[PDB]
Write a protein that binds this ligand. Structure first.
Ligand SMILES: *[C@@H]1O[C@H](CO)[C@@H](O[C@@H]2O[C@H](CO)[C@@H](O)[C@H](O)[C@H]2NC(C)=O)[C@H](O)[C@H]1NC(C)=O
Ligand SMILES: *[C@@H]1O[C@H](CO)[C@@H](O[C@@H]2O[C@H](CO)[C@@H](O)[C@H](O)[C@H]2NC(C)=O)[C@H](O)[C@H]1NC(C)=O
Ligand SMILES: *[C@@H]1O[C@H](CO)[C@@H](O[C@@H]2O[C@H](CO)[C@@H](O)[C@H](O)[C@H]2NC(C)=O)[C@H](O)[C@H]1NC(C)=O
Ligand SMILES: *[C@@H]1O[C@H](CO)[C@@H](O[C@@H]2O[C@H](CO)[C@@H](O)[C@H](O)[C@H]2NC(C)=O)[C@H](O)[C@H]1NC(C)=O
Ligand SMILES: *[C@@H]1O[C@H](CO)[C@@H](O[C@@H]2O[C@H](CO)[C@@H](O)[C@H](O)[C@H]2NC(C)=O)[C@H](O)[C@H]1NC(C)=O
Ligand SMILES: *[C@@H]1O[C@H](CO)[C@@H](O[C@@H]2O[C@H](CO)[C@@H](O)[C@H](O)[C@H]2NC(C)=O)[C@H](O)[C@H]1NC(C)=O
Ligand SMILES: *[C@@H]1O[C@H](CO)[C@@H](O[C@@H]2O[C@H](CO)[C@@H](O)[C@H](O)[C@H]2NC(C)=O)[C@H](O)[C@H]1NC(C)=O
Ligand SMILES: *[C@@H]1O[C@H](CO)[C@@H](O)[C@H](O)[C@H]1NC(C)=O
Ligand SMILES: *[C@@H]1O[C@H](CO)[C@@H](O)[C@H](O)[C@H]1NC(C)=O
Lengths: 66, 411, 188
């Protein structure tokens, strides 16, 4: 296959629409890995997505330690 | 309440050099002759690759410090503080803020210089992280510090109202919470005015980003001198080698070629050494920036003149071309007044020392007050402790102490 | 290894060894080849020394950082964030390794959080009450005071609260009762 990235042209890798942690950095936010029996090039995932409940009169207090 | 700006460089520009094109051009005879000098280019490639990976390591260490990406809730009330200029703006396609846009715009037929340098074997590689990812990291850090506080730097993010967070920080610097709870509106107005002044200064002044511009200028000057070195004879007949080959016989052409090769190799060596030194300095700056990010943004620092000039309250990060910008919010006293003091109070033949504050007098009476704010109170046994008689301490004075129990005995 | 391998270069001379150069050419002419070889080898060795100096400087910086970490994290307790580990620092231990040190950091991390409703101050008898070293919480029916980093509810009293001003200036104040521990024993 052929793929056009801002770092050039990539031949031999198939582009997928998922996102994983980077294994081999190619550049411009594009990384590559060996998975599935094949080589897949993907876009980096910064991390999990979270939201915090904020209001005038709410607090969170811990009840245990480690 | 004061807001101060700090600028720190983080990374550099990644470069790659092609030996054969730079030295021998498009001549095959020089290409054949070059092999005699051994392995002089594998070392150069290794050094440049090391610098290139070092830059990405620097950026990742500085910015990637949060495991989860947070978002601010749609409601934008934070106790009167605006924050609308430093939070992401969804309208623009870059998902950036006003100050970030100003900072990026601040630092900047015919053929472009980049193409001309590329056509001689000097190329620039792209960084691993785009600007959007750095913006997302900055937004996540801002959301975490606004909503959770410093709890997200040591575990899970626990929500807390902004006013109570400010009260905790005031307690940290050494002032009680009632000051904030009674001057919330004034503090919010001061913060908004300071942010507006920062806006005006950024929009007007164009010389506050010197360090990143100096980095860019140094890189440009190094490339310029490397390119200019190609047009010097080094003691030969001419710089152009085809004329040397055509004009005169091989016996002296070999000497001329050797002179040119030695000169160009020496120039490349000098360039690599200067690049190594500059990269070491940039890495030191990046380490300092990472430490500052971990100490001033994810917590409160007691160190003096580290996270701002004054008493530190908190800080905010923003991105910049090849660098980071810190907005420090700090506390400074004003409108001071003179008073008369004593070290202890001798009452009932016993010495009395304050528990938290200091003793003051306004001319006739005596009070106890906190250190960083004028708030007098009557000297009682609840805010005083006794140790020994009053004939040893130098400078003790006479007064009376109030006991909150005897009034209740008779009433 | 690369310094050793550089010895096979010719640097434009007729051979990579000296004895054959001295055993094939007259003294008037061998000088140019000897000069070329000597200059090349000197340049290689100088480059090696310079790179060694730069690497030594970096190692010195790392050693200074390790010394500071040993001074603060091990011999004492550090309040710096993310310096002696992730979390709240408790203590640390050193161990040795070939050309390096290994630090084991023992730290404290909260877990098992729970939601609560809070107010900044309590209005009682026309006066505002603020916590001393805690925070006000409520479980939907009653009110308590608890420490920040652990759950330990307690009854609001005079001993753990202080008063300043009226209750018509603080935003978010609520009405409740503050228990006086002097009258009940006085009236008994
Ligand atoms: C805090 O967590 C510890 C474990 O991380 C809890 O200890 C366990 O509690 C469960 C349920 O009470 C018991 O069945 C286990 O035997 C306990 N020990 C272990 C090793 O699992 C502890 O109870 C938690 N604190 C509170 C207040 O529940
Ligand atoms: C926060 O700051 C923004 C921008 O400075 C304020 O929006 C301005 O509001 C005034 C009047 O309310 C208008 O005249 C301006 O045109 C507005 N500017 C922009 C850029 O929108 C906003 O009022 C401030 N306060 C809050 C609560 O958002
Ligand atoms: C505290 O007292 C000092 C000394 O009395 C004041 O300093 C003097 O202030 C007057 C102005 O009223 C000046 O003319 C003198 O020159 C000052 N003396 C010196 C040595 O500088 C000081 O102003 C008082 N504090 C305040 C807040 O007024
Ligand atoms: C020092 O502070 C005392 C406060 O105790 C002042 O005394 C008060 O003065 C006002 C005058 O407006 C009277 O109405 C109050 O009754 C006074 N208080 C008491 C307890 O009698 C005093 O004026 C201040 N200044 C000096 C120089 O003593
Ligand atoms: C503070 O009060 C004490 C009360 O005992 C003073 O002590 C006496 O003061 C009188 C008056 O000058 C003297 O005649 C006594 O000799 C003092 N007694 C002793 C044991 O020294 C004390 O002087 C007062 N403080 C000041 C600064 O005068
Ligand atoms: C909020 O906390 C109070 C204080 O503990 C709870 O009141 C107690 O609830 C237990 C539950 O069985 C009773 O045995 C006690 O008699 C109650 N004490 C008092 C003084 O009423 C209350 O139940 C808690 N609320 C909720 C919703 O859990
Ligand atoms: C706490 O109690 C006071 C009374 O001690 C409440 O003040 C009353 O507020 C109502 C309005 O809902 C007025 O009509 C009354 O005149 C007020 N009383 C007095 C004596 O001024 C106060 O509202 C209570 N707090 C809350 C949050 O409801
Ligand atoms: C409570 O939060 C709402 C938004 O959820 C806000 O409009 C209101 O002003 C807040 N109340 C106080 C007292 O801050
Ligand atoms: C607190 O309430 C929010 C509101 O949805 C919830 O997401 C969160 O899980 C709650 N916290 C706990 C500890 O249950």
């Amino acid at each position: 296959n052929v793929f056009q990235t801002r770092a050039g042209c990539l031949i031999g890798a198939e582009y997928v629409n998922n996102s994983y942690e980077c294994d081999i950095p190619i550049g411009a936010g594009i990384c590559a890995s060996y998975q599935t029996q094949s080589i897949i090039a993907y876009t980096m995932s910064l991390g999990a997505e979270n939201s915090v409940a904020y209001s005038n009169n709410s607090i969170a207090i811990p009840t245990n330690f480690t | 309440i004061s807001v101060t700006t700090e600028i720190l460089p983080v990374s550099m520009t990644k470069t790659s050099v092609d030996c054969t094109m730079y030295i021998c051009g498009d001549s095959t005879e020089c290409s054949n002759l070059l092999l005699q000098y051994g392995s002089f280019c594998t070392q150069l490639k290794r050094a440049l690759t090391g610098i290139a990976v070092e830059q990405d390591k620097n950026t990742q260490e500085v910015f990637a410090q949060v495991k989860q990406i947070y978002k601010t809730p749609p409601i934008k009330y934070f106790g009167g503080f605006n924050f609308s200029q430093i939070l992401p703006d969804p309208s623009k396609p870059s998902k950036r803020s006003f100050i970030e846009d100003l900072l990026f715009n601040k630092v900047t037929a015919a053929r472009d210089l980049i193409c001309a340098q590329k056509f001689k074997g000097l190329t620039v590689l792209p960084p691993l992280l785009t600007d959007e990812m750095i913006a997302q990291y900055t937004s996540a850090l801002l959301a975490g510090t606004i909503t959770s506080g410093w709890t997200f730097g040591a575990g899970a993010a626990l929500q807390i109202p902004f006013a109570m967070q400010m009260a905790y920080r005031f307690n940290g610097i050494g002032v009680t919470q009632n000051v904030l709870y009674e001057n919330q509106k004034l503090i919010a107005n001061q913060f908004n005015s300071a942010i507006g002044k920062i806006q005006d200064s950024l929009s007007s002044t164009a010389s506050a980003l010197g360090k990143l511009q100096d980095v860019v200028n140094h890189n440009a000057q190094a490339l310029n001198t490397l390119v200019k070195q190609l047009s010097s004879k080094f003691g030969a007949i001419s710089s152009v080698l085809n004329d040397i080959f055509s004009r005169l016989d091989p016996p002296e052409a070999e000497v001329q070629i050797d002179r040119l090769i030695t000169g160009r190799l020496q120039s490349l060596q000098t360039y690599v050494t200067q690049q190594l030194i500059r990269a070491a300095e940039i890495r030191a700056s990046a380490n300092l920036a990472a430490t500052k990010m971990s100490e001033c943004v994810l917590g409160q620092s007691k160190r003096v003149d580290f996270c701002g000039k004054g008493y530190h309250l908190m800080s905010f990060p923003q991105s910049a071309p090849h660098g980071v910008v810190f907005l420090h919010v700090t506390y400074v006293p004003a409108q001071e007044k003179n008073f008369t003091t004593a070290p202890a109070i001798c009452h009932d033949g016993k010495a009395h020392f304050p528990r938290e504050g200091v003793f003051v007098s306004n001319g006739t009476h005596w009070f106890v007050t906190q250190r960083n704010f004028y708030e007098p109170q009557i000297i009682t046994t609840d805010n005083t402790f006794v140790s020994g008689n009053c004939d040893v301490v130098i400078g003790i004075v006479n007064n009376t102490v109030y006991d909150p129990l005897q009034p209740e005995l008779d009433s």
